[PDB]
């Protein structure tokens, strides 16, 4: 009742904050316009009106920057978020933002590719895997995570709660007030359990599998940060986006 209003509240805010949702993405991928398919260097050149490894990586950065802004706007709508200490608000975003991006990137993906440029394109998994030395390894773990995660079959309303659970992790480094975060998160976890019991009544053990994926995201995010440092050792004066530099600065 108070837990359904919380679900309904989070769904509305998720729709206000995130312009490309799992429902919008899946409507495009299922076969109902039509995105340009980029499967090689030729098709890429063809669909440029909608160094490549580096040009694609910069797109990954730019879209990751916009996602941080969307996640920050969404976080503010989480009941209690704004009244937590401001340093704790920073920490929660700084540590949880890459887990959410990973979760939400799964929403645009299948085993063959990813929806790009607001749904106008579709870059193949084989074309990204085909990129030079470090850049070729960038997407593959995201694809492997999406395949196992998309099989859970969550929609936008389920995901709205899960994203809120992730932001409100009381175990992030340097938090000043653990208890208020854990308390909001218990309410959010309850809400999540009830949403999955009603939205997937046939799907027993879904909240369980979802909590395991939540634990997995931590390991999955460190591996992505490890990969980003490999880029900095190989590539020169290029650098990361001020905001990304700021999130990645001293983790």
């Amino acid at each position: 009742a108070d837990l359904r209003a919380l679900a309904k509240h989070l769904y509305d805010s998720y729709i206000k904050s995130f312009p490309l949702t799992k429902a919008k993405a899946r409507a495009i991928l299922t076969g109902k316009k039509s995105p340009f398919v980029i499967y090689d260097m030729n098709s890429l050149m063809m669909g440029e009106d909608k160094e490549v490894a580096i040009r694609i990586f910069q797109g990954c950065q730019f879209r990751s920057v916009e996602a941080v802004q969307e996640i920050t706007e969404y976080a503010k709508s989480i009941p209690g978020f704004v009244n937590l200490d401001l340093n704790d608000q920073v920490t929660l975003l700084k540590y949880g933002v890459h887990e959410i991006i990973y979760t939400m990137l799964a929403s645009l993906m299948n085993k063959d590719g990813v929806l790009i440029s607001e749904g106008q394109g579709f870059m193949t998994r084989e074309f990204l895997k085909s990129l030079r030395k470090p850049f070729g390894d960038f997407m593959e773990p995201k694809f492997e995570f999406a395949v196992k995660f998309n099989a859970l079959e969550l929609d936008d309303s389920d995901l709205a709660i899960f994203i809120a659970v992730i932001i409100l992790s009381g175990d992030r480094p340097g938090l000043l007030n653990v208890k208020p975060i854990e308390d909001i998160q218990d309410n959010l976890l309850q809400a999540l359990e009830l949403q999955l019991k009603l939205n997937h009544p046939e799907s027993s053990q879904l909240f369980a599998k979802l909590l395991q994926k939540m634990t997995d995201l931590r390991q999955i995010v460190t591996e992505h940060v490890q990969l980003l440092q490999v880029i900095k050792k190989t590539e020169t004066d290029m650098s990361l986006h001020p905001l990304l530099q700021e999130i990645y600065k001293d983790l």
Binding site: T72, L86, Q89, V90, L93
Partner: peptide, 16 residues
């Protein structure tokens, strides 16, 4: 946090 200028501004004022 002073060491997170953009994050702080996004939280305090939103995206410009």
């Amino acid at each position: 946090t002073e060491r997170h200028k953009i994050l702080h501004r996004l939280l305090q004022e939103g995206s410009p």
